[PDB]
Design an enzyme around this catalytic site. Structure first.
Site, mmCIF file in Angstrom:
data_model
loop_
_atom_site.group_PDB
_atom_site.id
_atom_site.type_symbol
_atom_site.label_atom_id
_atom_site.label_comp_id
_atom_site.label_asym_id
_atom_site.label_seq_id
_atom_site.Cartn_x
_atom_site.Cartn_y
_atom_site.Cartn_z
ATOM 1 N N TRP A 1 6.977 15.107 46.664
ATOM 2 C CA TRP A 1 7.761 16.083 47.455
ATOM 3 C C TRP A 1 7.301 17.501 47.219
ATOM 4 C CZ3 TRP A 1 10.885 13.911 51.001
ATOM 5 C CH2 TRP A 1 11.330 12.609 50.746
ATOM 6 N N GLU B 1 25.895 13.766 55.044
ATOM 7 C CA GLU B 1 24.705 13.944 54.227
ATOM 8 C C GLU B 1 24.893 15.202 53.367
ATOM 9 O OE1 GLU B 1 21.078 13.023 56.073
ATOM 10 O OE2 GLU B 1 19.837 13.778 54.406
ATOM 11 N N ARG B 2 24.798 14.982 52.066
ATOM 12 C CA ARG B 2 25.060 16.013 51.075
ATOM 13 C C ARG B 2 26.482 16.576 51.256
ATOM 14 N NH1 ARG B 2 20.904 13.962 48.449
ATOM 15 N NH2 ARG B 2 19.059 13.964 49.827
ATOM 16 N N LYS C 1 15.598 19.743 63.917
ATOM 17 C CA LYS C 1 14.721 19.430 62.786
ATOM 18 C C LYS C 1 13.575 18.566 63.301
ATOM 19 C CE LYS C 1 14.760 17.252 58.197
ATOM 20 N NZ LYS C 1 15.649 16.630 57.167
ATOM 21 N N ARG D 1 3.941 23.718 48.314
ATOM 22 C CA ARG D 1 5.013 23.543 49.283
ATOM 23 C C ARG D 1 5.647 24.890 49.650
ATOM 24 N NH1 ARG D 1 10.407 19.623 48.755
ATOM 25 N NH2 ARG D 1 11.673 20.836 50.303
ATOM 26 N N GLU E 1 23.457 28.512 36.609
ATOM 27 C CA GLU E 1 22.029 28.721 36.413
ATOM 28 C C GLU E 1 21.625 28.645 34.940
ATOM 29 O OE1 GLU E 1 20.299 32.371 37.819
ATOM 30 O OE2 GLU E 1 18.294 31.515 37.830
ATOM 31 N N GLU F 1 10.271 15.732 56.918
ATOM 32 C CA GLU F 1 10.867 14.609 56.199
ATOM 33 C C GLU F 1 10.927 13.368 57.092
ATOM 34 O OE1 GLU F 1 14.441 16.356 54.592
ATOM 35 O OE2 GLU F 1 13.284 17.291 52.976
ATOM 36 N N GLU G 1 24.536 21.256 47.276
ATOM 37 C CA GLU G 1 23.634 20.163 46.897
ATOM 38 C C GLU G 1 22.964 20.376 45.556
ATOM 39 O OE1 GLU G 1 20.535 19.369 49.798
ATOM 40 O OE2 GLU G 1 19.764 17.700 48.610
ATOM 41 N N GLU H 1 19.302 30.410 57.241
ATOM 42 C CA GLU H 1 20.103 29.239 56.947
ATOM 43 C C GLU H 1 20.439 29.228 55.446
ATOM 44 O OE1 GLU H 1 18.419 25.504 58.270
ATOM 45 O OE2 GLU H 1 19.713 24.386 56.851
ATOM 46 N N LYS I 1 15.370 28.742 55.886
ATOM 47 C CA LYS I 1 16.329 28.773 54.758
ATOM 48 C C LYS I 1 16.134 30.028 53.920
ATOM 49 C CE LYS I 1 16.781 23.751 54.323
ATOM 50 N NZ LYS I 1 16.794 22.578 53.380
ATOM 51 N N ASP J 1 13.852 24.693 48.762
ATOM 52 C CA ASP J 1 14.969 23.910 49.272
ATOM 53 C C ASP J 1 16.284 24.179 48.564
ATOM 54 O OD1 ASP J 1 16.542 21.993 50.574
ATOM 55 O OD2 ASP J 1 15.855 20.335 49.363
HETATM 56 O O1 LIG Z 1 17.324 20.842 55.214
HETATM 57 C C1 LIG Z 1 17.070 19.624 55.392
HETATM 58 O O2 LIG Z 1 16.915 19.060 56.502
HETATM 59 C C2 LIG Z 1 17.172 18.729 54.122
HETATM 60 O O3 LIG Z 1 17.542 19.596 52.976
HETATM 61 C C3 LIG Z 1 17.576 18.946 51.678
HETATM 62 O O4 LIG Z 1 18.065 19.964 50.797
HETATM 63 C C4 LIG Z 1 18.475 17.670 51.650
HETATM 64 O O5 LIG Z 1 18.102 16.872 50.502
HETATM 65 C C5 LIG Z 1 18.335 16.786 52.925
HETATM 66 O O6 LIG Z 1 19.484 15.928 53.018
HETATM 67 C C6 LIG Z 1 18.251 17.591 54.253
HETATM 68 O O7 LIG Z 1 18.030 16.787 55.437
#
Ligand SMILES: O=C(O)[C@H]1O[C@@H](O)[C@H](O)[C@@H](O)[C@@H]1O
Ligand SMILES: O=C(O)[C@H]1O[C@@H](O)[C@H](O)[C@@H](O)[C@@H]1O
Lengths: 675, 675
Positions: free
Chosen positions: A537, A155-156, A278, A332, A507, A282, A389, A383, A356, A361
């Protein structure tokens, strides 16, 4: 089959050799054995020597001595000041007899980190005649998170398929996992989670007997390099694999089921690191599903792991993923702080909140998450996302170390001046038992591991910053380039320049003034200004024919600035003091608003998008001047991506400039080409 | 397991029965056997009678007689005027003795279509004492295209999974395929392609011995209901399954490979219909890949099938799927005509060009494809989309028969007035050997077959229009509703009203004034004004702060209007005569431009989006008034979708109104709520 990355150990000329006859290994634990083996490898490859391994010193032999304090005949004052377990000292003997180098670790892992440091010195061509070095990590947890799925996808992931899994099983044998551990340990990484935070059906079983022998084989290899293994978990496992009717953390049988699961995992992996979680994010399941808060839900897992010394890494990436775009009150960016700050003081001490770098995100620029500094009674770790991504997906060059230093050096003023993020997460500010930093892996099965050859610099630099956040970006780039491409001063200056300017360049042609996003939905690559603008979102820019930006002020907007301590909150709250680079994150302003730079917002957008493309072309031109000083294969590998970058940058430039000309109706000051 | 749809054959009361003692079946071919069986089924279910099947008439028995002309003792003048093979006559004997109904077909399939017509009359409660009916189809090919994949998915399928395939194989047994054939034959459909035009790896092998026995079992069932079976093919099959180094249609061995493939298929299916071909479209392979044109490429396949009577259905959905959004000269709407009009006269006579109703891609409204009427020397058939990809995906109600009649009745003036599309594709205008119409299937494994119960009306109505394009939408809706829900006059008026107004209602809250699109990319469902606006698919609205629309004029735009014959080209070319409903397809205009309706363009957008939501609510209110007159299950099934429709319509309304307020800055005349 794959590149050595920064551990090339390139053969030296005849004027750069060392004379050693023995390596003195005072212990024979697996970690020491790995340390001796790395030293033999590097010395053979660089110096063309093969000193004999012995476990008692020969007083007339030139030697390198490896041991902990308790193996020393004489414990000297330098090594006597070590306090951190993974700390070490490297010192050259100041006797006139044989040449001796002492690598003295507080523990076995300290000897391994010292062995890699000593080889780093040799690769860099440093004079070791008179070394006196002391090194101790600042962050206790220095972790990598894998987003690998057991079907082999990542994923990513932009650097190939999983090196751990394929076809819903473990890859058998493992040579590459060993070299990966060498790479991680060389930059001090001491912890890893091997599976995606989105834990799917097969992956849920990683905590069951069906796969634990496989997990343990992988954990055995990492343990030898001082790395603890973690698993991401499915919070609903009591239902999906345990046959329980609920996964409520207050249900007695659920609590027991996690205790039994923990006991079973420690029978296969006695030093298992713990779980990454997690939850309630999501659409992934969590305590909220059962009406409980995240202290109740983390604590339950924490109690299961507590008798065995494991840790719960509880991710704070929680927000309303079903937001109404019409609702301009909901922000958000406020979600993580509002969810977790109220719970300060309620967590068990082996819980760490993983947050994070920013509150949205992983965008190319975000302000720092306000949770850092806000929870004195709760362990926190940051994190970061090494896989790119939203920062170019390793097609565009983007050295992320400068951005990470901005976050790390950001002063929260939580306890007045000198309350930098790095002091929060290194645990010194609040006395955290466990804390540190984690990074989402950028590797995959591509032979150059990271997709873009130059993205190896991000894995390298993640590790160096996690060891010591005070290292400059300049010296990290210098170390990486010299070790990976050699010491030609044109090669070194050129690649360091490319790395250090790459983030700003990307950027410049992507989203303006900190507003984020403007990416294609789904895969998240490339320009699409309205891509998520009417989606659910929570990611809006509110651009209209007069202006743009999110009003996050307390005076007229979402009040997000109040999550900062007063010094930062006021800076961001005021239109006139808010820094340009974050302006549209915090304020909604007319296109004619004038920035600190003197530019209007709209002309700023046009300028950076035109000029960014010119800077990407310059990145490619400078790499081209290195032809002949880089091996053909890596030369062409990187050149191909820089050309892909230049072409894609033109798209970013023209899509954003046209969008904003179409909305604003204001032409470019300089008459440049807007379609 | 599934609904009977419109073939309910509901039991009549005691005042609506018929007296018959015998069915006279003059032949015993499979088609006749299927026809007798349907008559026995309908008479038993409606009339509670089971007349004996005999093959010679009993002169004192009340009977229904089934035969072709050559089985008649006396061939009467009505049946003597039949010319079409699938034509039939139904007439009541005018003797005073026993009651006799004669169903006389030109061929066996004519008897089957006549049997379904007679049962239709009974379902509708018509007096059959004095029938005199003659019916002949206008379109020779009346075809359904399936977009089914062998993994069980259906591309753009909103009604469940494939009823043909699962797990890369055929579903074994087949009862449902038989009922599907009954449904298709009841509305006269005589041809079907069972697999997706996007032919993937497994599906390529449908033309090989590995799957032909399975294909043939399915073809056997359809043949019994008068339906010919077709396969979509992979143009690159000579390489992918034949091991040839090329699929160039001019390569002698490729030509031979297709001849051998054709011979082999006809050994399994001696009446195989032929191939459907998507080539050189959306990255699917074709002649262009080898530098050849589509006459060369179609003709090669045509020659392979020619000795066996098969047909090549060559799709004209060809365009630049890698368009630069900056390039305002290139017009996707021009592509099909520019590709195929030059080839008129070059195709073999068993090639039919299959052309969608409009030149873009099945949008809620498109002008008619200019290829119709433009190729007097080439067989043409029209392709419509029964599955609702851009017309609500069977979540929103959308009865498509009114739109199809607009296309069918559009006068191309190819040979002056009276050159309607329906005369092009029925082959009468140009004397085409083979021609007609095809529709992309809207069915799937859902028990109600179409997702939305009321979308059954679209499959029904496709078939009725393909039989006779002159049927009114009103009478098609009337027949469908009476047969599916009964004859309560409140039920009939209400559902007919819902059907007949549904397309306009959905257009009202989706894209304005014919410009198309404004859908989410990927799945294509729901609002996203800029969704493809900077993409490479050729689908742009060019909206800016002053105006909107595609300039397709000859005077200042892409010149697309010149593809029409002069009468239509001039109507569309002029700003003042272009019909409002297509204005933005043809002109780029300011938001203040005034329409024939008197509305400005912008206020038109606001009006139809607010008012469309009010009309969807009215759709739901009227269905609710039918509670108690519809069975609970179908009542709730439809009500659930109407509520989903109303909620989604609010989203369409608000996203489009806000987008255009943000761009135009012009408020709603009436002060209604724009976020
Ligand atoms: O941090 C997370 O869980 C999510 O971060 C996003 O940036 C990403 O699109 C997802 O794939 C991921 O699951
Ligand atoms: O007609 C075609 O081939 C194409 O039509 C489009 O409307 C649809 O998005 C595709 O799935 C399809 O393949």
């Amino acid at each position: 089959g794959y590149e050595p990355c920064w551990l090339r150990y390139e053969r030296k000329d005849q004027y750069s050799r060392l004379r050693f006859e023995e390596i003195v290994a005072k212990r024979t634990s697996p970690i020491f054995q790995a340390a001796v083996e790395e030293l033999q490898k590097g010395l053979r490859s660089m110096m063309e020597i093969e000193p004999q391994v012995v476990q008692e010193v020969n007083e007339t032999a030139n030697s390198i001595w490896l041991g902990t304090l308790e193996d020393e005949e004489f414990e000297r004052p330098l090594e006597g000041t070590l306090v951190h377990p993974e700390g070490y000292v490297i010192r050259s003997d100041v006797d006139d007899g044989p040449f001796r180098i002492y690598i003295i670790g507080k523990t076995d892992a300290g000897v391994l980190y010292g062995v890699f440091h000593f080889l780093r010195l040799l690769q860099m061509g440093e004079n070791i005649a008179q070394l006196s070095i002391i090194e101790q990590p600042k962050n206790r947890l220095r972790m990598i998170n894998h987003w690998d799925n057991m079907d082999g996808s990542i994923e990513r992931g932009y650097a190939g398929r999983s090196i751990f899994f394929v076809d819903d099983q473990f890859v058998k044998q493992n040579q590459r996992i060993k070299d990966y551990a060498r790479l991680l340990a060389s930059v001090g990484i001491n912890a890893i989670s091997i599976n995606n935070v989105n834990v799917h059906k097969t992956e849920t079983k990683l905590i069951t007997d069906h796969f634990l022998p496989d997990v343990a084989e992988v954990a055995d290899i990492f343990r030898t390099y001082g790395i603890k293994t973690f698993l991401s978990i499915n919070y609903a496992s009591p239902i999906e694999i345990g046959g329980l009717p609920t996964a409520d953390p207050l249900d007695p049988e659920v609590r027991w089921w996690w205790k039994e699961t923990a006991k079973r995992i420690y029978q296969y992996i006695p030093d298992f690191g713990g779980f990454v979680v997690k939850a309630d994010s999501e659409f992934r399941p969590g305590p909220f599903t059962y009406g409980r808060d995240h202290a109740e839900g983390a604590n339950m897992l924490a109690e299961a792991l507590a008798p065995f010394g494991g840790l719960v890494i509880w991710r704070c990436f929680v927000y309303n993923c079903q937001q109404d775009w019409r609702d301009r009150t909901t922000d958000r960016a406020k979600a993580a702080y509002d969810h977790f700050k109220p719970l300060d003081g309620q967590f068990r001490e082996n819980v760490i909140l993983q947050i994070k770098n920013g509150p949205m995100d992983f965008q190319v620029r975000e302000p720092v998450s306000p949770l850092f500094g806000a929870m004195p009674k709760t362990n926190q770790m940051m994190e970061v996302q090494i896989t790119q991504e939203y920062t170019g997906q390793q097609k565009h060059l983007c050295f992320l170390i400068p951005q990470w230093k901005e976050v790390l050096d950001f002063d929260t003023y939580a306890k007045g001046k000198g309350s930098e993020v790095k002091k929060v997460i290194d645990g010194s500010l609040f006395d955290y038992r466990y804390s540190g930093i984690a990074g989402v892996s950028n590797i995959g099965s591509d032979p150059n591991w990271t997709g873009h050859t130059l993205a190896q610099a991000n894995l390298y630099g993640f590790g160096r910053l996690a060891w010591n956040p005070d290292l400059s970006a300049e010296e990290i780039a210098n170390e990486w380039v010299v070790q990976t491409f050699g010491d030609d001063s044109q090669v070194v200056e050129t690649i360091s320049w490319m790395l250090l300017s790459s983030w700003r360049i990307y950027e410049n042609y992507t989203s303006p003034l900190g507003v984020g996003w403007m990416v294609n939905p789904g895969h998240h690559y490339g320009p699409n200004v309205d891509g998520y603008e009417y989606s659910h979102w929570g990611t809006y820019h509110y651009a209209d024919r007069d202006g743009i930006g999110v009003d996050r002020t307390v005076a007229t907007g979402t009040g997000y600035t109040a999550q900062y301590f007063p010094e930062n909150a006021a800076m961001y709250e005021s239109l006139d003091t808010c820094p340009d680079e974050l302006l549209l994150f915090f304020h909604h302003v007319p296109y004619t608003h004038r920035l600190h730079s003197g530019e209007t917002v709209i002309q700023h957008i046009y300028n950076t998008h035109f000029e960014g493309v010119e800077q990407a072309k310059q990145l490619r031109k400078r790499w081209e001047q290195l032809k002949g000083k880089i091996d053909e294969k890596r030369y062409h590998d990187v050149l191909e991506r820089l050309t892909i970058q230049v072409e894609h940058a033109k798209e970013w430039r023209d899509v954003i400039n046209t969008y904003f000309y179409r909305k604003s109706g204001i032409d470019d000051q300089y008459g440049r080409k807007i379609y």
